[PDB]
Design a protein around this ligand. Structure first.
Ligand SMILES: *[C@@H]1O[C@H](CO)[C@@H](O[C@@H]2O[C@H](CO)[C@@H](O)[C@H](O)[C@H]2NC(C)=O)[C@H](O)[C@H]1NC(C)=O
Ligand SMILES: *[C@@H]1O[C@H](CO)[C@@H](O[C@@H]2O[C@H](CO)[C@@H](O)[C@H](O)[C@H]2NC(C)=O)[C@H](O)[C@H]1NC(C)=O
Ligand SMILES: *[C@@H]1O[C@H](CO)[C@@H](O[C@@H]2O[C@H](CO)[C@@H](O)[C@H](O)[C@H]2NC(C)=O)[C@H](O)[C@H]1NC(C)=O
Ligand SMILES: *[C@@H]1O[C@H](CO)[C@@H](O[C@@H]2O[C@H](CO)[C@@H](O)[C@H](O)[C@H]2NC(C)=O)[C@H](O)[C@H]1NC(C)=O
Ligand SMILES: *[C@@H]1O[C@H](CO)[C@@H](O)[C@H](O)[C@H]1NC(C)=O
Ligand SMILES: *[C@@H]1O[C@H](CO)[C@@H](O)[C@H](O)[C@H]1NC(C)=O
Ligand SMILES: *[C@@H]1O[C@H](CO)[C@@H](O)[C@H](O)[C@H]1NC(C)=O
Ligand SMILES: *[C@@H]1O[C@H](CO)[C@@H](O)[C@H](O)[C@H]1NC(C)=O
Ligand SMILES: *[C@@H]1O[C@H](CO)[C@@H](O)[C@H](O)[C@H]1NC(C)=O
Ligand SMILES: *[C@@H]1O[C@H](CO)[C@@H](O)[C@H](O)[C@H]1NC(C)=O
Ligand SMILES: *[C@@H]1O[C@H](CO)[C@@H](O)[C@H](O)[C@H]1NC(C)=O
Ligand SMILES: *[C@@H]1O[C@H](CO)[C@@H](O)[C@H](O)[C@H]1NC(C)=O
Lengths: 588, 588
């Protein structure tokens, strides 16, 4: 019959042995565990012979679960590709023990059916750093045939943590998943998307884990390295189309550093809420003291957020995963809260103009400004709902109405619904989507600027300088193209808005009309505020042009009060900038 | 050491044997295969002892692949549920053989680490009906621990086929997937969504398979039965929340009948195109003879269609999978083509009114009708783009503008943009979403009907009868509620449109004005056409209220020319009905 050989081998020892169609090798391993200190066990095997027909079959048997594979392991690409790996390392799943100290046995068996010998080296390692300590960085190497996973044990008094994993070289692609502590652990390429919360990453990833979702007060962080970098956004290699010939990928590896850090406590929310309310209520107090002296987008966003919450797939929404603090079912509560200033400040504009109008009516004994105020209020709803799940499908509304508001300003400089609709449809056309665009957009910009100047000695030279600087900005955008058209469009919009604001001031200076102190302070304050507003807008925390794995590279931590990142500062300063721009028009 | 026993057993024989922590059993099986006739091998094992701690570990070793499991198998639910199964059956994957006749060996090994005996019965069956013959129905039983799969070999001269699988009892839920013929086959619960094209189903499913995507001229149909019916849309059982106690599900089984049938050939496409063009060009010929005598929805739909095409997940779009014939990258080309009548017939309306207007101007020597014609043309784009991937996220536009067009008709009966916008926003509000709705909707309907009658002896009695029948329809909708509000809204809209059409005719009859022959024929023809149009609309081929697995139950085959289903007939007759309704207004 078949010859079976047995050995009671030990940890930390590479055994080199031969196997053919006749030999079956059994290795028994004893392992010591305790309830307080749990440590993982890793099986690592190499094959030093090249066989394409009959591989070696390895099985690892435990008390509860069994695992099995074949080496040289063959993984699958995209177009019926076959990648060959010779080294495979896997970490066994050990269910939590009941008794204080129980000795666990596990067996490793080797077999094959090839008619010729084959040499393999096998080693079992007692993985020392199985448990992840809070606030400590651990670096490890993973390839496509060597998935890894570490157990993190929620400390006493921690509500939730964040797992941050970073890498230096962007490629190869990888998947980082969080799973509950229950055998078995899905660390293979095909079942890694079954349960848990997973993110595909190339350089950086961050996953927020809560204790309410894990009753056992622990979880597993599983890292897997893909074979083809198409998911991360790379360019697939143009290897010959071999249907039944496996091609080796050479040396592909990923070095990753993982750190689990406690998240913000409840104070961060209270300080962030009090700070936001304190800033905007100060304008209400100041105005009282002075007086004394989209639906379909909402449905899509809600559906996508529910899909993210229930599926565990975190590749749908483009959050700022490094600084995004959840509350309830909302995954990034600070991003929603940052738009509260739109509501309060737009409503303050309605108060101030209502006071002005009633004063004028009493003395005697405005619709466009109301439209701008209502647009500002609508920002606080539409942009807030967008940030519940940012994506390329529903991105236009985040900045579109903003351009629309600018139009109203321009209209009050020219002195309605038709021009607003034209602006909305042009924004939709432009954001539907590219060197041909890079050229046609510049041509259309030049033509539109010339026509706008024509419709409007000092004036002709002034418009010539405006067109010259506009063409300079167009060439700037065309040459390097460091950012998307979405940022560029808002940039040219605000620059042209301040540009026309300055032209009106210059026309006033050429006349004998003297600007009062209040409008002068208003224009200066609005301009300086818009400065930092554009500064923070040009950061680009998350970009939706590329794959989400790439979009994760530009995440940055919380900057203000440990609650708000740069985009929230953009919201905060954009609200003030529009308030000042409107007050410039009102008091002009 | 460990005691290993060996036996060279045979097919079609149940072996009952005992295993404990000391015994390891090996069974060698010889198998005969040929290139022309490939037949599958199934391993079936039962355990007759109840053990919760230490299960039996079974491994099946082949020349190329290894498989392993443990019984009593434990599957996972939704809220850390554990279901226990005692019978497991799996079909081995056999790579295609090179030589004409090669004998394949495979081994089955049994082990366990429990300190007490355990009895198991194991049997290997040479599955006779492994290959699926075209146009033949095969019935089989699958449970959650007994996934099955059959090989379908594309015949000579068949471009593409459709796999139709049906069941009688709606539960339990299941997943039906199509995969290429390459070891291994992902028939487990966790990896069934890795590759291939898969649909979750409860009663019916249909998957279209093409030869260009399968270079080996064959594929695998894999059926898996889930554990919890939440995905299919059922109600989860309220078993006690046992974290570490597995609960048996009793006897859960699914009987399925599968049939692979060649798809429509190239002629059906040509006959369908010539039929569609022939119908609409006949109206152009008739008019010449008589004369001689949304963007964001488009982006979302495109993204979802690409996601379906590349992911293999067919649960995103709610097609009529029984009658949906693809072409190029489009998955249901007939559904898109059925809207061509909107374009042609709306454009014919523009021709006829342009002729009428130029005749009037020449004799002397209309904007609202143009708006309706343009709305009809816009249907042919918006509804066509919707049908590329129907879903609850983009459904509003499929029927929304429909009511909007009706409004224009009503307006020309009352004799614009404001009422149209009000109708659009009310449709959005109503379709955002429910007994509270079932009552409030009826109340609002009654109030709106009364107000509309008030704004408009014979008249008062006439409006009283109209309100009475409208309340009758409201009670009809409220009592049984067999369909969604989406069908009901269009139903009441068209009924009220014909109702006002008839009221105007009655007002004409009460006067001495005699209706000319042409308008009388027009009203009669429009009414009879709208009859069958509503008849075909009330069918409900696909409903998006429930889960897609349930939405698949109401699929029906092609009815007209083997290319068009009922919804295409609804499109065809709705186009004619609006053309007749418009011609009624023009010649009134
Ligand atoms: C686990 O098993 C190993 C394998 O037998 C044990 O290692 C042996 O221990 C004895 C006791 O001192 C030595 O005499 C042998 O030389 C060891 N084997 C080898 C290959 O060196 C080990 O002791 C076991 N663990 C425990 C806790 O008993
Ligand atoms: C991860 O892999 C890298 C690359 O093999 C390792 O870096 C090498 O480490 C060895 C041992 O210290 C050095 O001799 C080489 O010079 C290093 N090469 C490079 C390019 O850095 C790294 O040590 C591995 N990390 C771990 C934790 O094993
Ligand atoms: C496959 O293996 C089985 C198991 O040995 C073979 O069955 C035996 O065949 C011989 C030849 O006639 C009989 O004398 C034995 O009694 C059979 N075994 C049993 C348990 O009945 C079978 O012949 C093999 N297949 C082929 C094609 O040789
Ligand atoms: C699928 O399972 C059903 C239910 O067990 C089988 O139906 C039974 O078949 C046996 C054998 O003919 C009869 O004695 C029972 O009366 C049947 N019960 C019912 C409720 O129909 C059915 O035969 C199985 N199908 C297959 C292909 O095995
Ligand atoms: C079977 O193989 C084992 C493994 O090397 C060996 O120790 C044993 O002597 C062999 N038995 C026979 C009868 O050759
Ligand atoms: C394990 O830790 C618990 C408290 O964390 C302690 O009570 C117990 O004594 C520890 N076990 C041992 C063996 O020290
Ligand atoms: C703990 O050990 C005792 C004796 O060593 C044994 O009887 C008991 O079954 C063990 N606990 C478990 C959960 O097996
Ligand atoms: C494998 O190696 C051993 C020792 O070198 C040798 O005796 C044996 O014949 C080899 N196997 C085969 C199939 O030749
Ligand atoms: C080992 O177990 C096998 C299986 O029953 C048996 O045939 C054999 O006699 C046993 N050997 C010893 C030494 O007990
Ligand atoms: C298998 O089929 C091919 C053609 O389909 C035929 O040429 C060949 O002879 C067949 N093989 C045998 C063993 O008959
Ligand atoms: C086919 O059989 C011959 C002799 O029986 C053998 O030499 C050859 O290797 C076999 N083909 C394959 C692909 O193994
Ligand atoms: C299993 O059954 C055999 C035969 O009845 C018996 O000899 C053996 O002792 C049993 N196993 C144990 C662990 O008692």
């Amino acid at each position: 019959p078949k010859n079976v050989s047995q050995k009671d081998a030990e940890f930390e020892r590479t055994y080199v042995d031969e196997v053919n169609s006749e030999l079956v090798n059994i290795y028994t391993f004893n392992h010591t565990v305790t309830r307080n200190r749990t440590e993982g066990v890793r099986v690592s095997v190499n094959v030093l012979n090249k066989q394409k027909g009959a591989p070696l079959l390895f099985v690892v048997r435990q008390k509860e679960a069994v695992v099995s594979f074949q080496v040289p392991l063959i993984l699958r690409g995209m177009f019926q590709r076959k990648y060959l790996y010779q080294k495979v390392e896997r970490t066994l799943c050990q269910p939590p023990t009941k008794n204080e100290s129980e000795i666990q046995f596990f067996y490793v068996d080797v077999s094959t059916l090839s008619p010729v010998n084959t040499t393999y080296q096998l080693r079992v390692s007692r993985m020392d750093d199985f448990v992840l300590r809070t606030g400590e960085q651990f670096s490890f190497n993973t390839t496509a045939a060597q998935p890894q996973y570490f157990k993190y044990e929620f400390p006493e008094g921690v509500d939730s943590v964040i797992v941050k994993v970073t890498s230096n070289k962007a490629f190869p692609c990888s998947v980082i998943s969080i799973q509950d502590v229950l055998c078995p652990v899905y660390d293979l390429d095909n079942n890694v998307a079954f349960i848990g919360m997973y993110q595909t990453m190339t350089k950086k990833a961050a996953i927020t884990v809560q204790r309410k979702d894990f009753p056992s007060n622990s979880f597993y962080v599983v890292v897997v390295v893909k074979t083809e970098d198409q998911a991360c956004g790379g360019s697939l290699p143009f290897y010959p189309f071999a249907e039944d010939e496996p091609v080796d990928q050479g040396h592909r590896q990923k070095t990753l550093s993982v750190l689990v850090s406690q998240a913000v406590t409840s104070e961060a929310y209270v300080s962030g809420m009090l700070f936001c309310l304190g800033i905007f209520l100060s304008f209400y107090l100041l105005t009282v003291l002075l007086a004394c002296w989209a639906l379909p987008v909402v449905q899509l966003v809600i559906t996508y957020q529910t899909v993210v919450n229930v599926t565990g797939n975190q590749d749908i929404c483009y959050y700022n995963f490094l600084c995004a603090h959840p509350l309830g079912n909302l995954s990034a509560f600070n991003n929603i809260l940052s738009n509260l200033g739109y509501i309060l400040l737009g409503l303050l504009f309605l108060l101030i103009i209502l006071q002005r109008e009633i004063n004028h009516n009493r003395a005697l004994l405005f619709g466009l400004f109301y439209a701008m105020g209502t647009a500002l209020m609508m920002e606080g709803l539409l942009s807030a709902c967008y940030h519940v799940c940012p994506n390329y499908t529903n991105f236009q509304f985040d900045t579109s109405f903003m351009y629309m508001i600018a139009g109203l300003c321009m209209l009050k400089l020219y002195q309605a619904y038709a021009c607003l609709a034209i602006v909305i449809f042009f924004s939709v056309l432009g954001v539907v989507f590219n060197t041909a665009f890079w050229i046609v957009f510049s041509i259309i910009h030049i033509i539109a600027t010339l026509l706008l100047s024509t419709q409007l000695v000092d004036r002709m030279v002034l418009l010539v300088m405006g067109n010259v600087i506009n063409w300079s900005l167009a060439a700037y955008g065309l040459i390097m193209r460091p950012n998307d058209f979405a940022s560029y469009l808002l940039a040219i919009g605000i620059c042209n808005l301040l540009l026309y604001f300055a032209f009106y001031i210059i026309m006033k200076l050429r006349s004998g009309e003297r600007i009062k102190l209040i409008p002068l302070l208003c224009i200066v304050c609005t301009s300086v505020v818009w400065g930092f507003a554009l500064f923070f807008f040009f950061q680009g925390l998350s970009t939706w042009q590329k794959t989400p794995a790439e979009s994760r590279e530009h995440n940055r931590d919380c900057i203000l009060l440990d609650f708000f990142d740069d985009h929230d500062i953009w919201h905060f300063l954009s609200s003030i900038a529009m308030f000042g721009s409107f007050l410039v028009l009102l008091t002009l």
